[PDB]
């Protein structure tokens, strides 16, 4: 507690503490079961006891409602989670970011979605990563992730919504990642990169599309660069039947 004057403690003998100042006017104070009970209880991992203990003579801001978001294996953290930030925090400390996305949402912010999405990739499962990463607008990170993950359906979704951004290390990726390159050919056509569009297409033996690009634009497709312009591109895309968006998990 606070008194209204500066003072010196006279000493503590009993529950009371007694004080006298320079002029020597007294103040006494009973040692309370306020702040003391709350943390005596929290130390002995009781949260049920601690809810009663919470009073407005000791609530503060960070000793009850946000000091209890300070366990790397959440315990205290589980109990106070009311702040959208405390909720966010709680999630990375478990490593389960399902709660993160919601806190991240309620923090109204993109940065949180990309960072929790990265943590998500760490717990292993890419469905959760996709959703986050899609709304942070990291379609190109996704495009990259996606053969790595072994999806081809999802990988196509990324390609279009990165086409429009002209992310040439987003839209561009996916065509390679599926066995045929056709995806690039159109995106590149829209970029006006006719050369690049032909080389990509031609090598897969999609010389007809490669030719379309040449004909619409400047021709000359004959040229052989430091890379092939017509040698087979075919890749067998993802031998896995269950993908890594469907990465298995049990979670502790």
């Amino acid at each position: 507690r606070t008194l209204d004057l500066p003072i010196y403690v006279t000493r503590v003998k009993g529950n009371n503490v007694y004080c006298l100042d320079r002029e020597c006017r007294p103040r006494v104070l009973t040692i309370d079961p306020t702040e003391f009970k709350f943390k005596l209880a929290l130390i002995n991992r009781k949260y049920d006891e601690v809810l009663h203990m919470v009073r407005n003579a000791k609530l503060v801001g960070q000793s009850i409602i946000a000091y209890l978001q300070k366990k790397g294996y959440p315990e205290v953290a589980l109990h106070f989670v009311k702040d959208e930030k405390t909720r966010f925090s709680l999630a990375l400390e478990c490593g389960n970011i399902e709660i993160a996305l919601e806190a991240a949402k309620a923090l109204d912010d993109k940065n949180c979605w990309e960072k929790l999405g990265e943590v998500a990739l760490l717990q292993g499962n890419h469905q959760i990563v996709e959703m986050c990463y899609q709304r942070t607008k990291n379609f190109d990170k996704l495009s990259f992730l996606y053969l790595i993950t072994g999806n081809l359906e999802k990988l196509r979704k990324m390609m279009k919504i990165a086409e429009i951004r002209k992310d040439m290390s987003g839209h561009y990726q996916n065509a390679l990642y599926l066995g045929d390159v056709s995806e690039r050919v159109r995106i590149l056509k829209n970029c006006g990169q006719k050369s690049l569009a032909y080389l990509s297409a031609a090598t897969h033996g999609l010389d007809e599309e490669a030719e379309s690009l040449k004909e619409t634009f400047d021709p000359e497709k004959e040229t052989i660069p430091d890379i092939d312009p017509n040698a087979k591109l075919l890749q067998p895309p993802a031998p896995i039947m269950p993908l890594d968006t469907n990465w298995p998990l049990l979670t502790v």
């Binding site: 507690r1 943390k39 000791k58």
Partner: protein, 813 residues
């Protein structure tokens, strides 16, 4: 009434009095007190009552004035209505035959974004739909736009009323006077109309058309407005290597540095840049265009170089222009900087040629010799030029004049081994009239190293050896020097061997030779005789002796990196060095909490008492540099109330007249003697008030010199480096660890931080934290660091001294 906040009772009296002048003056006095920001609603009924219908413009204009700066706040005589006492009889004002009252009324009415006046401002455009002046038509386009802004982005404000509702902007374009309040969000048709108007312009109006719609296909079409946009448009169509030759930019640009030398200096810079784009080596920086003023035809009359000569300066114009000019000579023409610096230096450095370039102050003379000479060290071609000019420097034949000359040239010989053999004979000459150290030092070194070349030496040295002047440092320099180069290649009555004898006596021995040396006792305590005495293994001969040393140069010696160099021309450098380049019982409990980066001081206010404390108010105070970002606002502290009340905190403010302690927190309640009590929430320090600022090594060094920092303490828990505890703690006493003052090696390597702050205490704060972390077998005190501290009268020095130990607070309520 300049600003008198209590005078409202007299104003009411003055506001109606039966004398029109008094009423006007009163209303005027209200305006001036509100504008400053002082008391005004008491008056309202009085104010409003005389003026209301009348066409008599002055009172009406005055009342019209007061409705754009406080109408909303004042309510005694107005209250809240759609047709308030701001506009009800000001529909008359709008519809008077005199343009001024209508016009004025229109103008304030539409100006407000008020919603209690939205309807009366809308047909208020009637007052100016007829345009008796340029002012009336402009007043109208601005008022329709202001109506559009005031909640009428749709059909209430967009078409015409009878001629304008958002259409004066269209009309203005084709009418005799233009002005387009249409800058944003308004009719497309008017925007289009302004384009047509570019041609049929009205010049003030053209600046209004132009902020909206810029870029022309033309050269112009006329008028300052079009002209001002035009230089912007030109810079687009040729961005390439600055503007080079400044366009219509030139006119504003002079005023930009009206104080007065700085304009010329700047102008000189541009003119030099413009001449040519050279190689762009070290101080050869001229950009802009390669050819546009060339350089150097041999048929060009009266040539480019005449303007180039201005830039070579001694001060030939004034000092600000001088510093710019020396750099600028270097910049257009040199090899790097070296070539044009030698020419420039030849002019500046001391001679017998001109006595407007020689001076009897020794350091400046010496420095000038070193600047000329550094060019040789930089570049070879210069060695050949420098040595004969150096001999001219000598020819002055004052004791001191020779002296300075001899001192650099001797360094040059260390660089330039048996290349400057020729100089020795010149150098001896002025060595005989002597009153200084410097002449002896230098001469003895030239004559000494050079011995093979000459044979004079007993004769030259001996007059000086038995002459007097000042001789401390003479000893050191003669000691390493006198014998050198070729064992027996001199003789006048003392060969090279007599010289080795002499050289040894002068160092610290004794011997009859050159009629004894002037002094023997060496210069500063460490130097002594002995090294050289041991030396001269092979008597003054190029081998592994004094000669070796003499005809070799200590470490790397190249460029103008200051390795046997001095970095351009000595006078320009002083200016560059200067440039620092600085960048009622009450109970409280409390903790500080941060959620979603909101920093707040949590306070809980407790009434443990049964007694009444009603009248309870809570305030957080502004002490000085501490401030409330919003006090706790609950009316709590009632019979047996526990409450959590949050007071937001800031650390940065401006000093208030109330106490300057920890944090003041005020709770109020019942009591009439101590209605307000001050009680505390947890610690905040005096240290907050300091303001952090930073220094560079130059600013630190300057301040070191400027005021003493002898004061030191050793602080425990400076075991750690600069980065860890010490930075964090130093931060809290608003300090920061910047640049070093260390000298690390295998024996050295205390961590050194140069600190700075600029405290709001009338002082700066500086310190150096030296962390004594063992890099030797005998540390100071092992790990720990001694912080040498200051502040400008060392009143904050002390804060640095102890706030670098430890510092931590926590609670867990």
């Amino acid at each position: 009434m300049d600003s008198e906040p209590p005078s409202e009772i007299s104003l009411k009296n003055d506001l109606e009095k039966g004398d029109v002048k008094s009423k006007t003056e009163a209303l005027k006095k209200v305006i001036i007190m509100i504008l400053n920001g002082e008391k005004l609603p008491g008056l309202l009924m009085t104010i409003i009552r005389f003026v209301l219908p009348l066409q008599d413009h002055t009172i009406k204009k005055l009342l019209l004035v007061f409705w754009e700066i406080v109408p909303k706040t004042t309510p005694d005589g107005r209250l809240l209505h759609e047709m308030i006492l701001v506009c009800d009889a000001y529909r008359k004002d709008l519809q008077h035959p005199n343009e001024f009252i209508r016009g004025s009324t229109l103008r304030f009415l539409c100006k407000l974004k008020e919603a209690e006046l939205l309807e009366p401002l809308m047909p208020a455009i009637r007052a100016c739909l007829e345009h008796r002046h340029s002012y009336v038509r402009r007043n109208a386009v601005l008022a329709i736009y202001t109506i559009y802004r005031n909640f009428e982005h749709l059909i209430p404000d967009a078409p015409e009323l009878i001629h304008d509702f958002l259409v004066n902007e269209k009309d203005a374009s084709c009418k005799r006077n233009a002005f387009m309040m249409l800058i944003h969000a308004d009719q497309d048709r008017a925007l289009d109309y302004l384009s047509t108007c570019i041609d049929q312009v009205q010049t003030f109006g053209d600046i209004l058309q132009l902020v909206i719609v810029e870029l022309i296909y033309k050269v112009c079409h006329a008028n300052p407005s079009e002209r001002a946009r035009f230089i912007r448009c030109i810079y687009n169509l040729l961005q390439s290597s600055s503007p080079a030759v400044k366009y219509e930019a030139a006119g504003t640009l002079v005023t930009l540095s009206s104080a007065p030398t700085a304009i010329k200096a700047a102008a000189q810079c541009y003119i030099d840049l413009i001449i040519k784009e050279s190689d762009n080596n070290v101080k050869l920086i001229v950009l802009d265009r390669l050819v546009e003023l060339k350089e150097h035809p041999a048929h060009e009359r009266v040539l480019q170089d005449l303007v180039m000569d201005i830039l070579r300066v001694l001060s030939t114009p004034d000092l600000e222009v001088r510093k710019k000019t020396l750099q600028l000579a270097l910049d257009l023409v040199s090899s790097r900087n070296v070539e044009e610096l030698v020419i420039v230096l030849k002019k500046e450095v001391i001679k017998t040629n001109n006595v407007s370039e020689h001076e009897d102050t020794d350091k400046y003379r010496q420095l000038l010799v070193r600047t000329l000479h550094s060019c040789s060290v930089r570049f070879p071609d210069m060695a050949a030029n420098v040595i004969p000019v150096l001999m001219e420097f000598l020819s002055d034949s004052n004791e001191a004049a020779a002296a300075d000359v001899l001192e650099f040239v001797r360094e040059a010989i260390q660089r330039f081994d048996n290349l400057r053999m020729l100089i020795v004979e010149k150098m001896l000459e002025v060595f005989h009239a002597i009153k200084s150290v410097k002449i002896y030092r230098g001469a003895l070194w030239i004559l000494g190293e050079y011995c093979s070349t000459k044979e004079d030496i007993q004769s030259v040295m001996t007059e000086v050896r038995r002459s007097l002047g000042e001789i401390p440092i003479v000893e050191s320099e003669i000691k390493k020097e006198a014998g050198e180069l070729k064992p027996e290649e001199e003789i006048t009555v003392g060969p090279v061997q007599k010289l080795v004898t002499e050289m040894g006596t002068y160092a610290t021995q004794s011997a009859l030779s050159s009629s004894r040396p002037t002094k023997k006792e060496e210069d500063r305590p460490p130097l002594r005789g002995f090294l050289l005495d041991g030396d001269f293994f092979v008597a003054a001969s190029l081998a592994t002796t004094l000669t070796k040393i003499a005809l070799r140069y200590v470490a790397l010696v190249q460029e103008k990196k200051k390795q046997n160099s001095f970095v351009a021309e000595a006078m320009l450098l002083m200016a560059t060095i200067l440039h620092l380049g600085k960048s009622d019982p009450v109970y409280a409990e409390a903790y500080v909490h941060v959620n979603q980066y909101d920093i707040v001081l949590d306070v809980l206010v407790v009434n443990q008492t049964s007694d009444t404390l009603q009248n309870c108010t809570l305030e957080l105070a502004t002490l000085g540099d501490l401030k409330l970002v919003e006090k706790p606002s609950p009316l709590t502290l009632a019979p047996h109330d526990f409450a959590n009340i949050k007071a937001n905190v800031k650390v940065a403010s401006t000093e208030n007249g109330i106490i300057f302690g920890n944090i003041v927190y005020d709770v109020s309640g019942a009591a009439s003697d101590r209605n307000c009590v001050v009680l505390s929430d947890i610690h905040i320090d005096i240290m907050d008030y300091i303001q952090p600022a930073t220094c560079t090594d130059a600013e630190f060094r300057q301040m070191w010199a400027e005021f003493e920092w002898e004061n030191k303490v050793t602080v425990n828990t400076n075991m750690t480096d600069l980065n860890d505890y010490l930075q964090h703690i130093l931060k809290s006493t608003n300090m920061k660890c910047l640049t070093p003052e260390k000298a690390l090696s295998g024996y050295c390597g205390f961590m050194a931080a140069n600190l700075y702050a600029r405290s709001i205490f009338g002082e700066d704060a500086l310190a150096n934290v030296s962390i004594e972390k063992p890099v030797h077998q005998g540390p100071d005190a092992a790990v720990t660091g001694h912080i040498r501290i200051r502040a400008k009268s060392q009143g904050m020095a002390l804060s640095l001294g102890d706030k670098i130990n430890l510092s931590q607070k926590k609670t867990s309520l």
